[PDB]
Design a protein around this ligand. Structure first.
Ligand SMILES: [Fe+3]
Ligand SMILES: [Fe+3]
Ligand SMILES: [Fe+3]
Ligand SMILES: [Fe+3]
Ligand SMILES: [Fe+3]
Ligand SMILES: [Fe+3]
Ligand SMILES: [Fe+3]
Ligand SMILES: [Fe+3]
Ligand SMILES: [Fe+3]
Ligand SMILES: [Fe+3]
Ligand SMILES: [Fe+3]
Ligand SMILES: [Fe+3]
Ligand SMILES: [Zn+2]
Ligand SMILES: [Zn+2]
Ligand SMILES: [Zn+2]
Ligand SMILES: [Zn+2]
Ligand SMILES: [Zn+2]
Ligand SMILES: [Zn+2]
Ligand SMILES: [Zn+2]
Ligand SMILES: [Zn+2]
Ligand SMILES: [Zn+2]
Ligand SMILES: [Zn+2]
Ligand SMILES: [Zn+2]
Ligand SMILES: [Zn+2]
Lengths: 168, 167, 169, 169, 169, 169, 167, 167, 168, 169, 168, 169
């Protein structure tokens, strides 16, 4: 088999690459399911109450799809892969399925689901940062970038649900 | 002069005078919509109506382009717009989208917008039915317009009621 | 009681079975979503000097199929339908068989075969939708026709690679 | 092996004669290619102060007809057909009569007559294709309809110049 | 409560009659909206080889006058006025006479005469607004001045076509 | 001795008190700078589902007012004036009262009231500058008029939100 | 022909022949500036003059556009440019901006630039005074130009002396 | 009419009738190339031919622009294109770039492309030699075209053989 | 009150968030005052000596305004705010007021003030980096980005005052 | 010291008379500057419905000739020459006769004649420069050739308008 | 001499700046030689085998030239410089000269050279990251960015030589 | 045996020594590469208030010379030549002397002298290539002429800075 120096420099640090890839896959799986589940959640932000909220949920959805594309590349660079079956992907997702709630006509119910998904993502990508910190500059940078946007996403929904200031 | 773009329609047994008459009435409604939606958008005020303005604005501008689009086709078919602007108002396929009395309730404005769009859907669907399998040019343009009226209705349905649609 | 939806009424007047249409739309649109996932993996494994040029053709199909998902999803909700609540449901009701990475994937022709079969299924799937909406539902027909148009192109791409059959660019 | 082409199968199921369709497509597309050549010459000879403003209208038609050629050529190969081997064959099978420079070309109305007759032939030609593919072949219909749409516009341009007949811009 | 509108107060302090100003603005803005309709028809009928180059000049005026309508309508509502409830009312209160298609429209000079008279009326109309707002209402003056500026250009275009009078481009 | 500044001489010939003008300009421009700061905080606290849509309107005003600061600052130096040496001086000489975050800011109407009052002060402030420069200083008048024009729009935005009063977009 | 854009000015008691005469002389100076600033910019050489070239270049190009701008207006008012280019030079509102003798000192070039701009300020200010409250079109264009001449003077004042201005 | 753009060439002792005749034959080859390269590109199929299509496409589109470019010049010199499109085919400077019999081997297609480009190089080089030192306009355009034919040959040489060239 | 997971992940590290926000506010305050004071400093880079220097001071001014916008967002994400009064902001600024010097007609006097402001900013943002290093990826990244531009700004003015090479 | 200018040395080695070349360049470039002035007037007077479409062709020539002036002026200074101190000197040394507005300018053919004669002079003028720099001065040749190229186009435009002679677009 | 605070903050950390600059110069020298040597290597990726490979080698070449431009700036900011002579630069390069191989007509021979150059770059920039980690935010960020692209470059050539998945 | 290269054959027919040409091209192109390196260092040391404005002129030359390297390198391979195997070879065969940082670099005139001498060498170098290819090799001549054209401009820039000699912008 071939010498992969991009991997060797990580192994020298004592980094467990199988464990890292496994965490990346679960985190990345959650991004893909988010892209699906946030589609439905955005659709159901209806009425005059929910109208302005759609574009905030839309932004999060599209940015999370790009988080999937971003970290997928890295998984393969490290010698890992995505699950063969899409159902496997759903089952190993780092996060709980962001289902449409029962009383979805109250947009706060939708916002709670979005908020919980984002909070899970924050914990998930923060764990990846802690592992790659001081060992894997490439993975750390990508994971830090993603984490940075999840923090923003949580801040958006916190501002809508509660009266908590954040951004724009 | 020989107009072959018309001859190919006549061969299909399409009544062109009747078609143009329908096109003019449908196109006239697009022009009045451009005027009336201006006033309806202006009065979507307050914190309730603020986000609604841009949705009404999008419909208004798209409907003006529907007028531009089908006006070209009317003249290609040998027809024309009414000589007087008041005639145009009178032959409009749709009822006048007047500002309602309790306009400070934005739902009243949304009701008027919704009714205007629903009329447009029925209007352009009729044109599609006549041109279907006979007039590819007019069908395509009418279909395109109808497609956007469906979207417009869906927007206002989502606002008035809690009914999902688009973006 | 429930709102009047005239965009749906004009379809019902034609005798169109809207529940049956929406069902077909959901299954077709579900296949576009799974394509987006499965083509990702298929594209990743078009490796070596043989597979290098093939990646961007598979990429083009993947990205266009994701936009097919976005496009028809909007229409499904306009018709009063919805996507499955669970992502696993979506996978299961898909109109097409799962485009799994083949066993001998290092032969790029094996991957091309899987891509081709997926596209061929999509052609049949969207053609059925066109036949139902033809002369009844202008909006759904136009969107389904547009999608079908690109699936035909996608098939043609992979036919040109697998066999020596001329198509496009 | 001879490959399964599902984009063709779905057409055959409708009872569409594909050999006859491709033959019509080739003759129509040939006329587009000759238009691109002949309209070059016709445009060149729209001279003087009378013909100056007419050049750009003939130019627009020329370039749009060249894109019609490019558009439908792709579709011909997707259907398993091809362009004629020889360029002279193409000229001979053209759906339309050759748009030759008239004898009294210094009268710009003589040139406009030739342009108009060429467009009128194209309208009839692409309308036939629409009638054949209508309800059977969504892809070919859509493309042919798009082209027909522009030929109708082109005829309208020249009708407005020759006679005083309103149209577009 | 009835709100304090300081953008209006600063005008009242100058001794400006706001009801009279708004009335003039509405009549002037109404003429812009009717122009957009009537110039459509006038442009359509600038046919033949004589009228071909004239279409785009009439087009430019039409589109610019539609933007004049949009521009001043905003200002009317800022001043606490509104457009007429009915579109027929708008037509009736228009500052200018209806720009009807003339009888011998096949002579493009007949159309140019109508265009010119409409522009000349607009110049007088917007010049009056400038005189009223001059030294009192900077916002309305600036907008009216901008519009007047383009009406002067429009008149100059048609004067150059009808007569041999130099102007612009 | 000191350079001849003809851009200033033409103003002095009109009898314009340049020291007094520059003073008014500095105080007006100081208010634009503090607006940029204070609107930042006000925008940040337009939270919840009530305040979400209001943020971008407050944002637009903030950014436009910062450009008003940039615009008139250039002019102040052209007239031989300058900004205060200390940033605390600037705050104190501001033409307008500090747009502090209100106590019950969680009611977005409280924030809107503060925004409205700031804009109303700016309208009065720039209108005074227009009155002084009117018929004497074309450059300062034009810039002050432009700014005033946008403050009128800003007021209209917040009037439409607080009360149901129609304006713009 | 009836020219209503002119009639509205005559009603104000504006002397149009006198106005056009001033406009032509002012516009002529803009044309000569375009020529003379070319030569002045070329000779802003050395390490001293290197940064100065682009400031002189900006003025030159803006002044050429002033010529284009007001030339249109002259013809709208029924006037015209001089038949001969030498006439234009002679009726210029400003003295010829000749390359000075000790041009290798860039301050000499800056002095010539500054004097030309100062003349332009006085020239266009006079036009503003005449058209003020009578001719909105000519006033607006003249005001716009004057505005840029003020900026141009400020640029050269900042270079020659230590006087702050802009960017 | 006096055509001075032609007179300046005649003074150089340039045979303009002979030049135009060569230009027409060279330009005719560009037009046929646009047709024939279409078919050649279509048949660069399989995994072997996939990357080759875009290189053949680039040549095809550039050669069509060569036709547009020199066609203008032919008319400036008082010449014209053949009345019949079949005449154009017959007077082409180059042999017809027919699809070869064993086209499924992409090297067969590349051979045809290469031969067509090599003919074009010789064709436009001849035009450069005639116009060299006499006709700056025609020389410049011919030189430009020749420059791209050299590049086209280099592309196909790199594909057929292992010969380095460009990108 | 609401659960803010973007904050919780920082608290787990042992990061003092009140102390961090306090440092961010003082640093961010200095960026805002820079935007004001560099306006005046740029205006007074006059003559043929100062002409080319204006655009370098302009670039720093505009980039520092964006540093204010950037870190302000983050302050609110962390549950902090800007001072209620603008005068408070000036008083808590991390840096000394970049006043116009007395002999400003010598452009070197202006450059000295600009240089001292930038040097203060370097120390200020470096302190923030040291605190957030290995605990707060989002704040660290933003502070590192800003620091990176302050280093460039100092290098610009060092190249003008002294003959010290840097960049472009 | 007097500096070594190698860009000039390489020309002197060819036996090129640089003083004579610069003199020709100045006279040719002077004609471009006067063209920019005179073509302004000529364009203004292409009025009526006859002259309307002709304006933009005269406009294109005017603007392109102004860029010819800018282009070759740079080269004159690179060769160690300069433009005349006085603008009147420039007019007098112009390679071409002054393109004055003709007496019967209301006939647009009279204007076209003047334009044509000016272009024909420019062709002869720049062709001379090409002949001198040919095989000696690559930079001056290339620039002169580029200009000549556009003058040939300009002559072709006016020949097509005056007479019925084909050319371009 | 002048106070350079951008350097002082590094010295406080205990960072050896002479040693760091020396490593930066050798790393940066390798980027410059890469720009030259990859030109030749790309030229010789000929035939129908090598055609698609040219653009991948082109991308690496151009990105490595930008790595040279990027880190050169930083070298001067730290008070270092490039070698006076270009031949010195070649001799101190961190990497072995990426010469055209003897059997270059086999594109795999070229790919091996490209791969070895990229693997050397990975080790080189990873060393810089390890030194600047937790001491020099600016240098670390730039070196991390470069490393990130070298990892991608290695992954490209690994995918071509062997059948190893990576990116696009 | 070896492929027929017609782009080379047409040159050989002219009697052009291609081996000698390629050799000159390589040495000229090598100097463009070393310029890119050496100008980097020279630009870096144009410090202080004296050198600030000079940096961007040196930058422009550096970047343009790197593109000269890219441009002619392509041509060298088209002619069947190649770049030196070792980068040290390239440095040694360079047509120009190494543009080293001078000892008293803190005087920007010392740096300008080095830049000027490098450009002057490039002018002579590319002029020689033009003389050889003149009337034989249109492609190489055109590229070499273009490069020469920019070296003349580069020299003119540095002549204007070092001495007071007018040039361009
Ligand atoms: Fe998220
Ligand atoms: Fe609508
Ligand atoms: Fe597909
Ligand atoms: Fe056509
Ligand atoms: Fe008008
Ligand atoms: Fe404001
Ligand atoms: Fe000026
Ligand atoms: Fe070719
Ligand atoms: Fe800073
Ligand atoms: Fe000319
Ligand atoms: Fe690399
Ligand atoms: Fe150079
Ligand atoms: Zn995410
Ligand atoms: Zn509509
Ligand atoms: Zn699809
Ligand atoms: Zn066509
Ligand atoms: Zn108007
Ligand atoms: Zn403001
Ligand atoms: Zn001026
Ligand atoms: Zn060609
Ligand atoms: Zn900062
Ligand atoms: Zn010219
Ligand atoms: Zn690198
Ligand atoms: Zn060079």
């Amino acid at each position: 088999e071939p010498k992969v120096v991009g991997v060797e420099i990580l192994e020298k640090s004592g980094l467990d690459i199988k464990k890292l890839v496994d965490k990346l896959v679960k985190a990345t799986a959650a991004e893909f399911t988010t892209y699906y589940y946030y589609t439905i959640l955005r659709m159901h932000l209806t009425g005059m109450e929910g109208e302005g909220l759609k574009e905030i949920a839309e932004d999060a959805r599209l940015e999370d799809r790009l988080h999937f594309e971003l970290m997928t590349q890295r998984i393969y660079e490290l010698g890992g892969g995505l699950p063969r079956d899409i159902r496997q992907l759903a089952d190993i997702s780092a996060c709980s399925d962001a289902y449409l709630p029962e009383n979805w006509k109250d947009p706060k119910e939708i916002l709670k689901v979005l908020l919980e998904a984002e909070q899970c993502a924050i914990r998930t990508w923060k764990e990846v940062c802690d592992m790659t910190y001081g060992k894997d500059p490439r993975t750390y940078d990508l994971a830090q970038r993603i984490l940075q946007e999840e923090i923003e996403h949580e801040a958006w929904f916190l501002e809508l649900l509660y009266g908590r200031p954040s951004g724009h």
